[PDB]
Design a protein around this nucleic acid. Structure first.
Ligand SMILES: Nc1ncnc2c1ncn2[C@@H]1O[C@H](COP(=O)(O)OP(=O)(O)OP(=O)(O)O)[C@@H](O)[C@H]1O
Ligand SMILES: Nc1ncnc2c1ncn2[C@@H]1O[C@H](COP(=O)(O)OP(=O)(O)OP(=O)(O)O)[C@@H](O)[C@H]1O
Lengths: 597, 634, 293
DNA sequence: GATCGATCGATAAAGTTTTTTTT
DNA sequence: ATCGATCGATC
């Protein structure tokens, strides 16, 4: 109402805490750079009046438009015409009833949720300012459609003998807003008896869209209003969420503040990063020092050279594990999932290997095909994780050969044939032929036939089962510490708070130090690896005279040059050194003699 | 009329003044308890239903639904005096009805059954989600009074009119948006489950319309049986057959319960009471503060089978479970215990798994051949004619405590066993075959019924020579129960004179006299009967969580280290980091049965001396030398 | 901490008020779900149903708390109270305000390790004295969020020792020796220990018409058996006609004069001393005979 | 009361390459 | 866009 409005233009130009005067001092600061938006922060709003909140929190749609018009008028005042309407962004943190209140009282009430968005759609257009002409008398009006009860808020009237529906929609003086129809999925840990999860639907506005990629946790605040589409028995309807503010966690397109890198620059000046991360990554893993160094260089990566001709160099690494059960080859892999920016966990069976890359289907509108799914289209930049590279006998091998070593797939199916980009990084952990007897026989028979998959991977660990009767009792001392008593929650808060790094700071950290520094190895260091390699092939061919066959080829040699590029991304030095590169071969030379044994 | 106003007085007296079985105000106690949880439900006892139908059989099977609407408004006043102002929250209550003495299948419905109470079983097929329903049609004119009050909309009939009490014109009726509450609505369609049916024929279809506080109680695939009313909706339009003088079928429901088992009862174990209110919870503490309960419970658990002790120690420990102890931002911890039996072909190993299926709360029995490599876990069923590729799981997502029989289906052993040994290792496994990348959560338990190639001692050599199952999948279990029977007389009669007496185990007072006959038939030597012992496992698992201490730990350090050392130089099958994890896990399983939250000293060496002997007793001829080390543990 | 936090959370320390009545762990979640459950509490706008919507709901508490007069007799809840405001930014009263200062004094960080421990409490003291002006605001809330978990932390062993049933009524006092449970590290500083006793004096705040004596506890975290043992005061259930002060400090002069083998009074308050492990067992043996009340 | 004229509302659409277990 | 049915007005 007008009276209500008189009670908001007189409130969002003098609200302040103690001499900062903030809401004029950001609205001006948001009219210079074109954004046209507010962040009210409703829990901070309550200082005026509980009544004016309660005329909002009990009734909808009317309140949003009245508030928007008041803000537009104040914005107009802070100038002296090209002036668009604004949009609001609200945010609070009460608690998130996950997906349980459905119809009881939470219809058109303010609500806060948490989910994982999986499926985006293409953009669209709805109008917000029109100009309408009649057939009979050339009448001219203008009707604005701001907020919604989707369309059919108000229809085109009959007034201007005169025939009905005399009006049309011209396209010469109009404005448009875009919706999304992105689909929210439940975070799959908090509905536990035995059931599958469900899903909802949500739309939004332009100045808060395209802020999400699928594969992230998000929190979300909004309305629970109801539409009705006539494409089921009783006159029913359907639920959806009009959303207001995605004040989620980080993106997990590199814009952020300066103090986030201030401590990072204050940490990177300390030259103790490489030895301290091996403890600070996995706080519940007994040592395993050689493997732990390989995981931090996998997550960072190398570079990508598009050198001045057609071809390119595949600048990344892909580790591979195998070993006996009970030796941490599997439980380590859930640990790399949370720390990655983008991580996918399809670790089982291969899951119908043609469906790993891309899939088509008949689509219900227009009876057509296009491309929808895939386990590799969403995992660019990050890392996938799979297992069991023995009993996928059908088609796992034919589905990763083109997927690796060029990362340029193209689907030859009934519709398109397009080379969509990929920058993926694979990771796997398998089993040999029941472990023990394989390492007590002729040392082949690990992958039963093919060496051609092994030559695409580069870095291979082989763990074993010793009987060291001394350190094992410390391991038996180690597991009873974590498993009950939970003193490592209090030990790794009394050794971490000055020395170690918590689990969530690295997710902040890795996305910054990758996306800034473009490094290059030292040019005079090229004498080192060339002098290194020539005896390794001699160390190879000293074994084949013993009637021994299989695997070392040159692709691992151009992988070590990516390995020495990896820690240069860690130290963020644009040039490499020789104390740098000798520790890198120190990691690989502990996996050169593995081919001998 | 007006005499039905007195009917509410005539039953609030007849219900609330007295509850049977020596008073105690049974129905007068379960009212306030479901008021405390704020869950909008009530029950009716069948024996009370037997006594509250004497003047009401001609008001149940004659008029089932409008009798209930006047039955609903008395239950408010039955608790308004008890809980004042309870109507200010959610303003509504509706009753539910318990079991009924009919056994109708899906086939046996005629005209005489309609507009009355019905009871039928089946299975739930394809189902929809949850919508809101208008439930109060505030009608709207255009020029006259546009508020005709919130109506009472029916089922699929679209109850409206053209003009009444305002004009007689063709002005249509519209909506507006003031104070119209919503109940929900969920149309599960039902298929007849292929149990009690003359086979070799087709299934038959119905429709079920649920109601407000009965949404999503069922899961797709699981067996249910429903008690409700019958209704008709002569829509005058059908388009599979031609239009004809026919009418459809709609079954509205008042209650729903889970699958039942061993359908031979007369007065219990068909109604899921599971409601430990007064006579149970006040009692169940003194049964927990005795000194030999764990020496009494596992002896009295499976009563039909005398046998060797250690299996009943293990299989009782399996369904008692441990704890899924979460942690900070690091790796989770398995909270499950997975036994594996090994038996001679002819000992009682197929029965303990059969008996434990009843005594659990939920189960599954996928056995032998025909177990698909995917059908255990989730699978994608393809779309119908206008739909999307959705996710319809099978066995393991339904079962939280499931039972399989992986003995030696060798032709399919190389198919499915790559899909069960990652339900434990990378626990909460789900898959993305040509669909969506998701991860369901299933903290399932696994028992097994392994079977060697012939006799139990098919070799002297270790178990890799005995079973065809290889090493690493076998190491995903905790313990190997193995049986022995060569030649005896006095131990042979101890089964032989025992099992012969088991075959000798072949109206208001007389209903309870048969119930008193049910006491003595299982209380020959009186081994703590199963009328109530299963009734507290359900809150022995969802109410109590245990913890440990630190001063009682380092005795186990040499136990893991030396025994692993003693079995690498003598390598039959190894132990790893996970055996000791199972050592402390089954330790706190026993302490959960004291209802105690602690861990004593008596439970550790108990739990040690059930694993160390059961590992060593399958080695070789040289088990005799290992037993010379054995009493050093004791 | 109600106007800061969630009227929900009373869920823990309303059982403290039922420990002020009769119970702590057995029946409370079976008991509490009528009075403090006028709804299964809605979490839609709950941040302003303990801020704002309680205009109608805590005024219903204004008309509940005279019909909960008789419901359990639980009248250690009505208090006159006092409050301050700021002009904006929400009200803050003075009842919860002293609670933040105590907890923030705790956290916020041979025989040579004690110097690096004795210098910690003086340092974290200093980040509280500054918290009395508007020149700092945004760390006052840090004590608020560190209030409502440490109480959950201090309870997490109090329910353990109460169901351990290791409180031995010897003749006059009751002896409890917390040897080692979990989470032992939060008991070096003495200010948590008086609160732990303040919860532990209330579990024995039933009738107890005879034997109204407070207890003496014991704990250890570090080397050479420091054992910052302490005593309490008995408490009246608000019916002082006999102002009982202390009987222990009189006897504390005796045992610091008789044995003289690693006994200390170096800690400041006389209600807290130190004792060695092989001397704390003959500590009570001179105390069970010396009746000095 | 019956007949004629005018106005308003309702009526017409189409399929056959990928992917699952199975023999 | 065309055809059929229903309602209103006029004879
Ligand atoms: N090196 C290690 N350090 C600490 N804990 C370990 C280590 N190796 C295994 N564990 C422990 O083993 C426990 C269970 O592991 P899990 O049962 O998943 O092993 P697994 O998958 O059989 O081993 P593998 O991955 O070799 O097959 C985990 O809680 C983990 O703490
Ligand atoms: N110890 C026992 N006590 C009582 N009955 C027994 C015992 N052992 C066997 N039986 C009886 O023998 C019958 C045969 O079933 P049994 O348990 O031998 O199958 P099984 O050999 O275990 O089958 P599988 O080897 O396929 O598991 C059972 O019905 C059971 O009643």
């Amino acid at each position: 109402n007008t009276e209500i409005i008189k009670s908001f233009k007189n409130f969002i130009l003098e609200f302040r805490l103690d001499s900062q005067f903030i809401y004029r001092d950001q609205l001006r600061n948001n009219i210079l750079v074109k954004n046209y938006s507010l962040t009210v922060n409703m829990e901070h709003l309550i200082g005026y009046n509980e009544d004016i909140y309660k005329k909002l929190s009990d009734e909808p749609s009317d309140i949003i438009p009245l508030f928007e018009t008041a803000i537009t008028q104040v914005a107009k005042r802070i100038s002296i015409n090209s002036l668009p309407t604004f949009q609001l962004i609200l945010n609070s943190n009460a608690n998130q009833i996950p997906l349980r209140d459905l119809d009881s009282e939470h219809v058109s009430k303010i609500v806060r949720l948490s989910g994982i968005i999986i499926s985006t759609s293409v953009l669209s257009s709805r109008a917000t300012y029109l100009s309408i002409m009649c057939r009979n008398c050339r009448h001219t009006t203008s009707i604005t459609i701001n907020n919604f009860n989707t369309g059919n808020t108000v229809s085109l009237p009959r007034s201007c003998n005169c025939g009905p529906d005399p009006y049309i929609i011209i396209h010469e003086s109009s404005k448009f807003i875009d919706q999304q129809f992105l689909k929210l999925q439940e975070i799959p840990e908090l509905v536990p008896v035995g059931e599958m999860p469900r899903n909802l639907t949500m739309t939004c506005d332009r100045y808060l869209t395209n802020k999400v990629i699928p594969g992230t946790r998000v929190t979300i605040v909004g309305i629970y209003s109801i539409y009705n589409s006539k494409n089921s028995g009783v006159a029913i309807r359907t639920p959806y969420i009009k959303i207001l503010g995605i004040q989620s966690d980080v993106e997990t397109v590199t814009m952020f503040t300066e103090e986030e890198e201030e401590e990072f620059l204050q940490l990177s000046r300390n030259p103790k990063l490489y030895e301290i991360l091996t403890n600070s990554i996995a706080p519940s893993i007994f040592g395993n020092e050689d493997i732990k160094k390989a995981i931090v260089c996998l997550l960072m990566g190398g570079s990508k050279k598009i050198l001045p001709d057609g071809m390119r160099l595949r600048g990344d690494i892909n580790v591979l594990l195998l070993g006996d059960p009970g030796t941490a080859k599997s439980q380590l892999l859930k640990f790399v999932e949370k720390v990655s920016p983008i991580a996918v966990y399809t670790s089982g069976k291969g899951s119908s290997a043609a469906g790993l890359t891309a899939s088509v289907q008949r689509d219900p509108m227009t009876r057509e095909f296009y491309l929808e799914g895939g386990a590799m289209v969403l995992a660019d930049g990050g890392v996938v994780c799979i297992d069991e590279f023995d009993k996928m006998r059908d088609e796992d091998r034919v589905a990763i050969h083109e997927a690796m070593e060029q990362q340029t797939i193209s689907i030859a199916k009934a519709g398109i044939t397009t080379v969509l980009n990929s920058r993926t990084s694979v990771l796997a952990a398998a089993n040999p032929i029941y472990g023990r007897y394989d390492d007590l026989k002729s040392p082949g028979d690990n992958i039963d036939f093919q060496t051609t998959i092994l030559s695409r991977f580069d870095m291979i660990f082989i763990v074993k089962d010793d009987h060291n009767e001394e350190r094992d009792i410390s391991i038996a001392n180690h597991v009873i510490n974590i498993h009950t008593g939970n003193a490592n929650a209090m030990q790794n808060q009394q050794e971490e708070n000055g020395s170690e790094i918590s689990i969530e700071k690295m997710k902040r950290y890795i996305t910054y130090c990758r996306l800034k520094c473009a490094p290059r190895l030292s040019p005079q260091a090229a004498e080192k690896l060339s002098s290194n390699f020539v005896t390794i092939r001699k160390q190879l061919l000293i074994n084949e005279l013993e009637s021994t066959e299989r695997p070392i080829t040159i692709r691992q040699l151009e992988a070590i040059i990516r390995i020495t590029e990896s820690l240069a991304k860690l130290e963020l030095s644009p040039i490499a050194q020789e104390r740098h590169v000798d520790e890198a071969i120190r990691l690989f030379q502990a996996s050169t003699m593995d081919a001998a044994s | 009329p007006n005499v039905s106003r007195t009917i509410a007085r005539e039953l609030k007296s007849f219900l609330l003044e007295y509850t049977d079985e020596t008073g105690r105000s049974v129905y007068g106690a379960r009212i306030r308890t479901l008021g405390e949880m704020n869950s909008e439900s009530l029950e009716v006892n069948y024996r009370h239903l037997a006594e509250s139908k004497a003047i009401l059989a001609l008001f149940l099977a004659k008029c089932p639904e409008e009798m209930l609407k006047i039955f609903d408004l008395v239950a408010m006043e039955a608790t308004e005096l008890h809980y004042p102002d309870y109507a200010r929250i959610h303003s509504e209550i509706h009753v539910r009805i318990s079991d009924f003495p009919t056994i109708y299948s899906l086939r046996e419905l005629r005209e005489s059954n309609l507009s009355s109470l019905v009871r039928v079983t089946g299975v739930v097929t394809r189902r929809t989600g949850v919508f809101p329903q208008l439930k109060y049609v505030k009608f709207n004119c255009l020029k006259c009074g546009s508020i005709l009050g919130p109506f009472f909309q029916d089922s699929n009939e679209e109850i409206r009119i053209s003009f009444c009490t305002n004009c007689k014109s063709k002005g249509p009726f519209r909506v507006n948006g003031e104070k119209t509450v919503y109940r929900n609505y969920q149309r599960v369609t039902l298929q007849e489950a292929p149990g009690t049916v003359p086979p070799g024929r087709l299934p038959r279809h119905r429709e079920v319309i649920l109601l407000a506080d009965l949404v999503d109680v069922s899961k797709p695939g699981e067996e249910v049986e429903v008690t409700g009313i019958y209704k008709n909706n002569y829509d005058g339009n059908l388009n599979a057959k031609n239009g004809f003088p026919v009418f459809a079928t709609i079954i509205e429901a008042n209650s729903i319960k889970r699958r039942e088992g061993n359908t031979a009862n007369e007065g219990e174990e068909g109604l899921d009471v599971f409601s430990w209110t007064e006579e149970e919870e006040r009692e169940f503490r003194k049964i927990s503060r005795d000194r030999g309960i764990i020496d009494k419970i596992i002896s009295s658990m499976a009563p039909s089978i005398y046998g060797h002790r250690d299996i009943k120690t293990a299989v009782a420990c399996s369904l008692f479970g441990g704890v899924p102890k979460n942690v900070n931002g690091k790796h989770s911890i398995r909270g499950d215990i997975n036994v594996l039996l090994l038996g001679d072909p002819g000992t009682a190993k197929s029965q303990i798994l059969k008996y434990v299926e009843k005594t659990a709360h939920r189960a599954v029995f996928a056995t032998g051949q025909g177990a698909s490599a995917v059908g255990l876990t989730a699978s994608v069923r393809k779309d119908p004619i206008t739909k999307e590729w959705t996710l319809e799981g099978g066995a393991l997502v339904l079962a939280d405590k499931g039972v399989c029989l992986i003995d030696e289906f060798d032709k399919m052993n190389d198919q499915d066993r790559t899909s069960i040994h990652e339900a434990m290792e990378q626990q909460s496994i789900s898959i993305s075959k040509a669909g969506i990348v998701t991860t369901l959560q299933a903290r399932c338990s696994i028992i097994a019924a392994a079977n060697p190639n012939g006799g139990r001692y098919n070799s002297t050599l270790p178990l890799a020579q005995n079973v065809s199952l290889t090493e690493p999948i076998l190491s995903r279990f905790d313990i190997l129960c193995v049986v022995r029977d060569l030649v005896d007389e006095e131990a042979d009669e101890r089964l032989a004179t025992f099992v012969v007496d088991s075959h000798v185990r072949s109206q208001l007072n007389a209903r309870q006299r048969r119930l008193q006959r049910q006491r003595k038939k299982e209380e020959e030597i009186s081994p703590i009967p199963q009328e109530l012992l299963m009734k507290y496992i359900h809150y022995a698992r969802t109410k109590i969580y245990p913890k440990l201490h630190q001063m009682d730990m380092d005795k186990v350090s040499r136990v893991y280290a030396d025994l692993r050392r003693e079995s690498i130089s003598t390598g039959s099958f190894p132990i790893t980091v996970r055996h000791l994890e199972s050592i402390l896990r089954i330790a706190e399983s026993f302490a959960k049965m004291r209802l105690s939250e602690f861990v004593s000293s008596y439970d550790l060496d108990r739990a040690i001396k059930v694993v160390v002997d059961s590992f060593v007793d399958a080695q070789k001829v040289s088990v005799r030398r290992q037993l010379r080390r054995s009493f050093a543990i004791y | 901490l109600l106007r800061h936090s969630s009227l929900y959370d009373s869920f823990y320390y309303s059982n403290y008020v039922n420990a002020k009545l009769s119970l702590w762990n057995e029946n409370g979640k079976k008991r509490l779900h009528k009075m403090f459950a006028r709804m299964g509490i809605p979490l839609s706008t709950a941040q302003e149903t303990w801020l704002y919507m309680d205009h109608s709901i805590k005024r219903e508490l204004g008309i509940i708390f005279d019909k909960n007069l008789d419901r359990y007799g639980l009248q250690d809840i009505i208090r006159d109270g006092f409050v301050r405001t700021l002009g904006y930014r929400g009200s803050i009263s003075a009842s919860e305000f002293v609670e933040a200062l105590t907890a923030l004094l705790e956290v916020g960080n041979s025989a040579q390790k004690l110097t690096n421990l004795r210098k910690r409490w003086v340092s974290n003291f200093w980040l509280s004295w500054d918290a009395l002006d508007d020149r700092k605001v945004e760390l006052l809330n840090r004590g608020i969020q560190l209030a409502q978990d440490l109480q959950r932390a201090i309870f997490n062993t109090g329910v353990a020792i109460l169901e351990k049933k290791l409180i031995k009524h010897l003749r006059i006092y009751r002896l409890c020796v917390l040897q080692d449970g979990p989470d032992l590290d939060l008991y070096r500083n003495p200010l948590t220990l008086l609160r732990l006793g303040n919860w532990l004096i209330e579990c024995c705040a039933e009738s107890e018409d005879k034997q109204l004596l407070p207890m003496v506890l014991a704990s250890i975290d570090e080397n050479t058996d420091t054992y910052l043992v302490a005593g309490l005061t008995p408490r009246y259930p608000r019916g002082t006609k006999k102002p009982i002060l202390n009987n222990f400090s009189m006897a504390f002069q005796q045992i610091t004069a008789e044995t003289d083998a690693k006994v200390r009074i170096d800690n400041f308050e006389s209600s807290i001393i130190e004792i060695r492990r092989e001397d704390l067992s003959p500590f009570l043996e001179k105390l069970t005979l010396s009746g000095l009340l």
